[PDB]
């Protein structure tokens, strides 16, 4: 659709950038090294906080409106951030770091597997709906708001 009414593509470009970055970091991290371990968790925490802001912006500026006008599924992150905090606060040696690493990798993989199709659905399903329930200028205005909150 026209760029000026597209409320997902730019935010999702950033979220996908952040996904690729944590996938790269995770693959390069030495989980036996406490500094590498904690640097990874700190990066993940900042990333997932931005993911949380993203979903909240969608809720407050896009989905609430779209649901009112069109009139079921209720548009994870908090649990992930809690997992990271546990790593930063409760892991004190190599045994605990490597046991944590296994659980961390399983949860991030599951998360990533769910998050990419989540974004795709917004683009493929919600955006067409936005065209049907809102005027072109109403959508330009929503996009201005969504960008201002992301950037």
PDB resolution in Å = 1.9
Determine if residue 96 is labeled as part of a ligand binding site: no
DSSP state of 125: I
Identify how many contiguous H helices and E strands the chain contains and give both numbers: 7, 0
Determine if residue 60 is labeled as part of a ligand binding site: no
DSSP state of 124: I
Contact between 44 and 22 (Cβ < 8 Å):
yes
DSSP secondary structure, 15-66, as one string: HHHHHHHHHHHHHH--TTSHHHHHHHHHHHHHHHHHHHHHHHHHIIIIIHHH
* Residue closest to 100 by CA, chosen among 109, 110, 90: 90
Determine if residue 12 is labeled as part of a ligand binding site: yes
**Which technique was used to obtain these atomic coordinates?**
X-ray
First to last CA, the chain: 21
The superfamily (CATH) of domain 1-151 is: nmb1532 protein domain like (1.20.120.520)
């Amino acid at each position: 659709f026209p760029e000026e009414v597209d409320v997902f593509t730019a935010p999702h470009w950033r979220m996908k950038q952040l996904v690729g970055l944590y996938c790269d970091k995770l693959s390069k991290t030495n989980f036996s090294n406490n500094n590498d371990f904690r640097a990874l968790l700190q990066s993940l925490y900042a990333t997932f906080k931005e993911f949380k802001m993203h979903e909240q912006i969608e809720n407050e500026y896009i989905i609430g409106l779209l649901q009112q006008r069109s009139q079921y599924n209720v548009h994870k992150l908090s649990e992930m951030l809690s997992l990271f905090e546990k790593g930063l606060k409760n892991v004190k040696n190599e045994y605990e770091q490597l046991n944590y690493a296994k659980q961390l990798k399983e949860r991030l993989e599951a998360f990533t597997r769910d998050f990419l199709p989540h974004m795709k659905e917004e683009e493929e399903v919600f955006q067409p709906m936005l065209m049907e329930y809102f005027t072109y200028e109403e959508l330009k205005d929503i996009k201005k708001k969504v960008i201002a909150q992301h950037c």
